[PDB]
């Protein structure tokens, strides 16, 4: 839907790992880069 809304921070994690792929566990979801 239209309209404007900001995304406030939730949590930060000081992990040293590296990531390249990701997965996911009426069932729809949008993916934007």
């Amino acid at each position: 839907p239209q309209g404007f809304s900001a995304l406030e921070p939730l949590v930060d994690l000081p992990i040293g790992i590296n990531i390249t792929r990701f997965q996911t566990l009426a069932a729809a979801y949008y993916v934007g880069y």
Binding site: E8, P9, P14, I15, G16
Partner: protein, 46 residues
């Protein structure tokens, strides 16, 4: 690799209405400090 374990860090008393050096979590300056009325957000610091 992010630092995950570090030693304890001390603290002193709080003073107001005097030009005093301050160290508020890595923020360093020199000026007087006083009570204010501006409203921040739960995640906003500076």
């Amino acid at each position: 690799a992010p630092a995950t374990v570090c030693g304890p860090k001390k603290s002193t008393n709080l003073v107001k209405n005097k030009c005093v050096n301050f160290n508020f979590n890595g923020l360093t300056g020199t000026g007087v400090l006083t009570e204010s009325n501006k409203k921040f957000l739960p995640f906003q610091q500076f």
